[PDB]
Design an enzyme around this catalytic site. Sequence first.
Site, mmCIF file in Angstrom:
data_model
loop_
_atom_site.group_PDB
_atom_site.id
_atom_site.type_symbol
_atom_site.label_atom_id
_atom_site.label_comp_id
_atom_site.label_asym_id
_atom_site.label_seq_id
_atom_site.Cartn_x
_atom_site.Cartn_y
_atom_site.Cartn_z
ATOM 1 N N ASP A 181 0.874 -1.204 0.000
ATOM 2 C CA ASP A 181 0.000 0.000 0.000
ATOM 3 C C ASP A 181 0.899 1.238 0.000
ATOM 4 O OD1 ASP A 181 -2.779 1.284 0.274
ATOM 5 O OD2 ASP A 181 -1.783 2.037 2.082
ATOM 6 N N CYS A 215 -7.448 -0.663 -7.518
ATOM 7 C CA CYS A 215 -6.655 -0.988 -6.303
ATOM 8 C C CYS A 215 -7.611 -0.764 -5.130
ATOM 9 C CB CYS A 215 -5.345 -0.194 -6.277
ATOM 10 S SG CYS A 215 -5.502 1.564 -6.709
ATOM 11 N N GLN A 262 -0.115 8.600 -6.443
ATOM 12 C CA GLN A 262 -0.430 9.122 -5.076
ATOM 13 C C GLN A 262 0.830 9.616 -4.366
ATOM 14 O OE1 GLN A 262 -3.106 5.735 -3.492
ATOM 15 N NE2 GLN A 262 -3.910 7.558 -2.472
#
EC number: 3.1.3.48
Length: 284
Positions: A181, A215, A262
């Site tokens: 993650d 995701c 991100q």
Amino acid sequence: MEMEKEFEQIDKSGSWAAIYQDIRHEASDFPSRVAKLPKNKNRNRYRDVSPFDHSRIKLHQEDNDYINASLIKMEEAQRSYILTQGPLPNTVGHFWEMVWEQKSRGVVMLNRVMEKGSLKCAQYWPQKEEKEMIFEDTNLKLTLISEDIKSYYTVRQLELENLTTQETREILHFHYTTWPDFGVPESPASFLNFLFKVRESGSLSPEHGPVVVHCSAGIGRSGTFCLADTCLLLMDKRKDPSSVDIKKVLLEMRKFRMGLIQTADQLRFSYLAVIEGAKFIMGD
Ligand SMILES: CC(=O)c1ccccc1Sc1ccccc1C(=O)O
């Protein structure tokens, strides 16, 4: 500027965080009014991740047409992608309705059902051939046909039946099973190997509706996959590798869905994957 030299220049100057914030600053901002309606609050996994109204996928029903999903249409590359969140316990039936209505051949999954000890998405596909799933709200049946488990990924063959018309289609599930993650998929090798397996399936080809990619939020790892695919295709279409600006392709993609890529490490990894993958595209 050859991205491989831009790469080494950013690396030696340690300015990845600065390049990344420049992208965040120039990124499109479009309204997301449907996503924020009170009737849709339980259809969204994250309060700060929404589809833009202009590019959102509409479910074909009069009741509520809303799903947290975006059509990314790359005009020059001639590729389309649907980027979506990991389905929620109450959106699993909407997810498979969308796959059906959009005529997708492939679902690409870049997360595990549990990461960092928390649930990142619902168990939305059957784990055993003899235990099929029925989605009563959308009138669909889903059956596991076969499963092929490799070291870095699993491929599944699924059968999707529209219970209304008894029409049937095979859908391929491509599950990348080792990406942390907000982490980077190890080294370009396993990622690129996985991308080429999706391509060879026919799942990304124009005879089929757009691939569905997810995701947990549908922006980070999902963003890395479609950015790397599109940049490699643009190198091919013209076979002029220099004529590819990864930062400009990312900003083009961000007109269709907010927040793609991100972290500054995800940006750096996207560069590595394109640079290493080009060493195939250019005839090796
Ligand atoms: C109805 C249809 O042809 C179709 C549209 C979209 C996605 C999957 C499909 S089905 C499919 C696609 C390729 C190869 C084999 C199959 C199969 O049915 O085994």
